[PDB]
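Q: what sequence does this backbone want?
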């Protein structure tokens, strides 16, 4: 009767986000529709539920605390269903959530979010995404020294980062005084 596939909804929302053409209304509509969609018990469904809740929360400064908990809960559900889904994307998501906003989650642990990010790097060193998110976490938690090798790996393969990821990396590098000071 026209109900959207959650995975396809996610891809459409992510396309808008990449373009910068997502409004609050677009993000909220995606959240409502994935919530309404039937759960097929897959890790993918749960990942999408978490990711879309996360995008809505991100558009509210990560201060939509109930949405952060919905993200946390569905990321854990996804991991329980298949911890290898999308090369551990749900574990990476959960790690980033904790390093950035763990203090706003009852069962979150900010510092242990770094362990999740380390786990993803250990399993999937080939993806600069993983190095970028690990570096982001170390920096967020005031521990720049271990971030530098990860920054160097992310910068070295920056052509494989999404536009959003490149802007994130470039912001971290601007904050340290410029990419020219990494001295990889």
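A:
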């Amino acid at each position: 009767a026209g109900q959207a596939d959650p995975l396809a909804l996610y891809d459409l929302l992510e396309g808008r986000i990449a373009a910068g053409t997502d409004s609050e209304a677009d993000r909220v509509a995606a959240l409502e529709q994935v919530r309404a969609a039937a759960d097929d018990q897959s890790a993918a469904y749960a990942y999408v539920r978490a990711a879309v809740a996360g995008r809505v929360a991100e558009g509210r400064g990560l201060k939509a605390l109930k949405l952060l908990e919905e993200m946390r809960t569905w990321a854990l559900t996804s991991i329980e269903r298949d911890p290898g889904y999308r090369d551990m994307a749900a574990t990476r998501m959960l790690g980033t959530l904790y390093v950035l906003a763990g203090q706003h989650l009852a069962d979150g642990d900010s510092e242990q979010g770094l362990e999740l990010l380390e786990d993803v790097v250990a399993a999937h060193p080939e993806a600069p995404t993983n190095h970028l998110r690990l570096a982001e976490g170390y920096i967020a938690l005031g521990d720049p020294e271990p971030a530098f090798p990860s920054l160097c790996l992310a910068q070295g393969a920056r052509a494989q980062l999404s536009g959003e990821e490149q802007r994130l990396l470039d912001g971290l590098l601007a904050d340290i005084g410029g990419a020219d000071l990494l001295a990889c």
